[PDB]
């Protein structure tokens, strides 16, 4: 009865989320026409966490896809699994954001936010009990970061006790692809620290080093980097849909993880990621899966967490495994390494197991780490914002429609403390 709603935001979220429904529907066994043709029997037993019913026994996914340009909605509808979405559930404006966070927060997107919520109140009416919403956006552009934030602060106010979850493409340090990035990213963390229950840091530079050094690909396009994120969003909530031993839902992973209510910026990673030459050479055992979770390469955020202590650590294993090999292997991390762990929590590890593996693997995991190294990309974003704002480099494109300048030095007030809050909890 515990079901969720999958909002998609911006143009980066529509590459993530359109690949998200080609992974879930692979798992639940749905054709592109929307009719069940699957193998096993408990596979559609919990189909109602995500999907919905229609006439004649056809299943439609539930979502709402927003954009400020109409080009992406035609691209999603012409996708491989693009037939199953309802045509009422697409909402889109007519004039693009133009990489302007202020246009996508005040003048170009606020006409649309009164029409997305009419879709959302129609999908949240149909529930038995909502577990929480879900959003996918990008912290680099205009229409993912502005209006995708304006969805959050209005959904949270009118659904206050649901477990809001997000997935964020944090901008890169220096290998970047927009001139006006730090105005776009520092103005979004100001409204993302106080309105989200969990938020994930997805570097686009740690998502290339995976695709060179542990997968050894040749031409890593965007078609598979959407897939690496879309295996983690399936991996966190496998405990929600499928049975097992020591299940842990979308909410019970939040309670164990965030010790103080401003420190909810995580860093994920997926455990068996093996090069296709070395598929013959990996050994399927539980300890070999664990050394990939805590390896510094499979961190998928922008900072190496050996520069500090983990605060709390998750591990959502999937498959068939003895749960003695689960609870012993996490202990051997906390004793071999001791200085890299916070010592006023006597056990830093939450575990979970479910019995239904991903399609085509024996077992898989999903690492979640609330490391204290995440202050580092908060300094590098803030240092590239206090150099622009010394002499007002690009400011007149944002100021001219109604944003005064004091909402920019208010942002670093709500940003330079959050650099410090990781430092006081770094030690003693």
């Amino acid at each position: 009865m515990r079901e969720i709603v999958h909002l998609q935001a911006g143009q980066c979220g529509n590459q993530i989320g359109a690949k998200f429904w080609e992974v879930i529907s692979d798992e639940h066994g749905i054709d592109p026409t929307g009719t069940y043709h699957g193998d096993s029997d408990l596979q559609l037993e919990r189909i109602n966490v995500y999907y919905n019913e229609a006439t004649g026994g056809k299943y439609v996914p539930r979502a709402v896809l927003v954009d400020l340009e109409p080009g992406t909605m035609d691209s999603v509808r012409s996708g491989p699994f693009g037939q199953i979405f309802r045509p009422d559930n697409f909402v889109f404006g007519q004039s693009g954001a133009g990489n302007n966070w202020a246009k996508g927060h005040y003048t170009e997107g606020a006409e649309l936010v009164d029409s997305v919520l009419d879709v959302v109140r129609k999908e949240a009416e149909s529930c038995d009990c909502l577990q929480g919403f879900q959003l996918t956006h990008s912290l680099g552009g205009g229409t993912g970061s502005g209006m995708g934030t304006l969805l959050i602060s209005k959904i949270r106010e009118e659904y206050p006790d649901r477990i809001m979850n997000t997935f964020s493409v944090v901008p890169s340090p220096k290998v970047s692809d927009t001139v006006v990035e730090p105005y776009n990213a520092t103005l979004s963390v100001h409204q993302l620290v106080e309105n989200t229950d969990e938020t994930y840091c997805i570097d686009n530079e740690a998502l290339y080093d995976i695709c060179f050094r542990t997968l050894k690909l040749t031409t890593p396009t965007y078609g598979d980097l959407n897939h690496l994120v879309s295996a983690t969003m399936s991996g966190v909530t496998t405990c929600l849909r499928f049975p097992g031993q020591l299940n842990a839902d979308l909410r019970k992973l939040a309670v164990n993880m965030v010790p103080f209510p401003r420190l909810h910026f995580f860093m994920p990673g997926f455990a068996p990621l093996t090069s296709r030459g070395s598929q013959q050479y990996r050994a399927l055992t539980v300890p070999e899966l664990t050394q990939q979770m805590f390896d510094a390469k499979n961190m998928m955020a922008a900072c190496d967490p050996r520069h500090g202590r983990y605060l709390t650590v998750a591990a959502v294993f999937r498959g068939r495994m003895s749960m003695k090999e689960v609870d012993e292997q996490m202990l051997n991390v906390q004793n071999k390494n001791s200085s890299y762990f916070v010592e006023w929590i006597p056990n830093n590890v939450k575990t979970a197991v479910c019995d239904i593996p991903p399609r085509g693997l024996k077992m898989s995991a999903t690492f979640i780490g609330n490391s204290t190294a995440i202050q580092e990309l908060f300094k590098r974003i803030s240092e590239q914002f206090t150099a622009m704002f010394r002499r007002k480099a690009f400011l007149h494109w944002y100021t001219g429609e109604g944003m005064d300048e004091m909402e920019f030095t208010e942002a670093e007030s709500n940003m330079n403390d959050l650099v410090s809050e990781y430092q006081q909890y770094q030690d003693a």
């Binding site: 296709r276 598929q279 013959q280 399927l284 085509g360 693997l361 024996k362």
Partner: protein, 51 residues
């Protein structure tokens, strides 16, 4: 685990087939286009002499 192994090798075979196809057909089409250049060049030279 063995059926995963054959799936891996199948993807290797598909990749090398596609690479050799792209190399072969695009070099042949380049040769075709350059013969077209030679023909058009000689026609324009004859036009110059006629004028």
């Amino acid at each position: 685990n063995m059926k995963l192994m054959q799936n891996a090798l199948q993807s290797l075979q598909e990749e090398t087939d596609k690479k050799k196809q792209k190399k072969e057909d695009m070099r042949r089409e380049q040769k075709i286009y350059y013969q077209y250049l030679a023909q058009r060049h000689e026609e324009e030279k004859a036009q110059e002499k006629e004028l």
